[PDB]
Every structure is written in structure tokens, then in C-alpha cells.
Amino acid sequence: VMNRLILAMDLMNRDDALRVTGEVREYIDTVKIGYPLVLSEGMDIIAEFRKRFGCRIIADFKVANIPETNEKICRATFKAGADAIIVHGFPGADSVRACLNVAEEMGREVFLLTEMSHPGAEMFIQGAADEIARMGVDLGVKNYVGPSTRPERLSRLREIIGQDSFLISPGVGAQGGDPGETLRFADAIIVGRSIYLADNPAAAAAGIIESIKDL
Amino acid sequence: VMNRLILAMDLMNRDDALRVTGEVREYIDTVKIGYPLVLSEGMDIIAEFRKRFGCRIIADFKVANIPETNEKICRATFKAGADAIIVHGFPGADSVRACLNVAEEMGREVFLLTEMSHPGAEMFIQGAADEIARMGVDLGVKNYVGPSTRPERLSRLREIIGQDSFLISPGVGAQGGDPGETLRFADAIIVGRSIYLADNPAAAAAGIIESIKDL
């Protein structure tokens, strides 16, 4: 992705989301849109963004339902124009395969979320994350999401998926993660509040990229 | 809930969803709406259903994000008129507490999903489900979701949460679960495809209710 930086656009009203994305567009080319924005303004916001900014859109829906429902959610998400969707691995392989089947039918991609970045991820997810990552490899998943807040876990994830897999990582900035350290293992970093709540989002994005370039 | 039966309305077309829900309204009073319908027709469908059918609406979003994001999703969901939202427990206690805080602020309810009903739930979720249920009790959760497809697990879940907690259960019909057996432990059963893909949804709902009444 451009500058290895993905904007997590979690503002909830269209005017603010459009203003901030437009202000930082010169520094990125991939925007992650999730339920805060889609449930507030509608799924049409995906195609509007894609067209307006000519960026790739990753739908952060972190799908975690039964196979049949996950299928329907993936189909609606790609029909809406998303280039990829993030899917939880903890519900198991059949739930993940349902998403991979729809992505294969629609020419899109699935990102598998393995371990989450917040504190509560240590309770149940962390203990299963290595096995969720290995399930991903066994299913042929090539795109993964791991935590910037725990670089030792991000390193172990990278170890399991290999160097050819693509790995993006949230938790940089607000949650405590560091851009440079995270980029030792991930291919791109996801950044939301550090940029979109900043007084000058473009300056915040530029400052992050400056540290990245130095790597 | 009326007749201990909740309709899972996962059709993706507004006209079909309104037709089927209207046909079975005399047998239920609680409709569960999830992302298949909301992402296809918009969040306004929740208020439309609530008004048109005068039914309670449970949002099956099975939220599984970090705390801050789960807060935003819950806020948007209750602003849309939902009476309750289903939240995954696997991401940990802070993620669940964020949802409980918004429900407290808005006068609504959270249902905690403990073990899922599909085959893949056996890989990672089942091993953590008893603890996820005990975490719910510790957080003061009073509404839970457990699997019709594994009544021995539903019994263990009921054992942990006590008789005062409200327990609803999906996987009846299409997934293989039985109404009567599931109602030995759950307070209400969720039914989707067995009713909404039936040639006569009202007759399908009626036949289920006749088996329930006889318990």
C-alpha cells in the first residue's frame, strides 16, 4: 500500500469522513472502512469513497458468524464495491472457508484476523492465535491481520505465515503501538484516531510517513 | 417472547423480508435482524420493522471488535431503534463491557454469545465457552446465546448462568437442532431458514409452535 499506511476511517458522519480522507489522500491509497461509518451512512459510502478517492477499500467487518451468514455478508460487501474484507479466524475453518469461497467467486480478497490488539485479546484469543494462523495457512489464506500492540506476537505470526503472505497491523498510535517497530514484521500499518482525531490529519499522516521512510 | 420463538430474518430483500415477517407476525413478537438484511437495505429497516410489526428487534451483529469500536457500533445500533444487540464474548471482557456501558446509557440490552452452533465452533470457541459464560456472569450479563445443535453444551451454559438469566438459542431446524430439546434449557429458540425459506412460512411457524405448546 502507498507508504505502507492504511487509514482506519471510523468517523461516523459522512461529511467529516470525506473531509479527513480527502486531506490525507496524498499519503495513502488504501482506506479501511468499518461498521461505525457503514451503519451510520450506509453501504453506498464504500463505492462513493472508492470513486471519489480512487483508493482501495478494505471492509473491516471482522465477520464472525456461521458459514451461511458469513457468505451473505461477504456477498453484500463485495457487491458494495469493497476490495477485501477482514474475517475473524476464531469461529473456525468452515466460517473462514465460506468467506474465501465468496471472495473467489467475486474476484476479491479475504484478510484473516489472528490475534487482536486490545487488552482483552489476551483472555481467549491469544491462546488460540498461533493455531488460527496455521489454520489460515492450511486454507490458503494469503492476507492476515495481527497486533501492533504486541510485536513479539506479530513476529510469531509472521513466522507462521511466511514472508510471502501480506500482513497488516492495527493498534499504532492511540492503542500504543509504534509504526517503525510494527513495520519490522507487518507490511503495512493501520492508523485511525492518531490521524482522524488530530487537529491536522495531513500533518499527522505526514509525520508517520516520515518515520516510516527512515526505516 | 411470544411462543418462545424468535424469527431470524436473514432474507436480503426488503420486499421478501417484509412479506415473510408479516405472514408470521401472529406467532411471534420478537424478530432478530442481522447484517444480511441491514447491509442490503440499510439500518432504517430496523425502525421500519419495529413500527410496522410492533415487534421487539434483536440486532444480530455478534460484535467482536476492540472496545472503542464496539462502543460506536452499539451506539449506532440502538440509535437505529434496536432493543438489544448480540455481542461475542471471545474478544474478552473489556470488549463486552464497552457494549454493556452503551446499553446502560441507552436503556437497552446486550445478549452475550458464548458458544456458536456451527461445526467450526468446536475448534476454538467451545474450549473457551464455559469461561466466556463465567466472564458474562462476572460482568453482570443477564441475556445469553448458546447452541441448539449441542444441547449438552446448552445445559452446561444454563448451569453456569443460572435460572434467572435469559437464554436464546439458534441452530433449530436447518442446522439440525430440535425445538423441544432446545427449550429444555433455553427460554426461546431462534429459527431462520426453516421458516423463511418454507413454501408457507406461517404454516412452518405454526408447526413449530404446536410442538412447543405440547412441552
From Swiss-Prot, chains A, B:
Quaternary structure and partners: Homodimer.
Taxonomic superkingdom: Archaea
Role description: Catalyzes the decarboxylation of orotidine 5'-monophosphate (OMP) to uridine 5'-monophosphate (UMP).
Gene: pyrF
InterPro entries according to UniProt: Aldolase_TIM (IPR013785), OMPdecase (IPR014732), OMPdecase_arc (IPR047595), OMPdecase_AS (IPR018089), OMPdeCOase_dom (IPR001754), RibuloseP-bd_barrel (IPR011060)
Entry similarity comment: Belongs to the OMP decarboxylase family. Type 1 subfamily.
The protein, known as: Orotidine 5'-phosphate decarboxylase
Alphabetized Pfam families for the sequence: OMPdecase (PF00215)
Residues annotated for substrate binding in this entry: 10, 32, 60-69, 117, 170-180, 192-193
Source species of the chain: Methanothermobacter thermautotrophicus (strain ATCC 29096 / DSM 1053 / JCM 10044 / NBRC 100330 / Delta H) (Methanobacterium thermoautotrophicum)
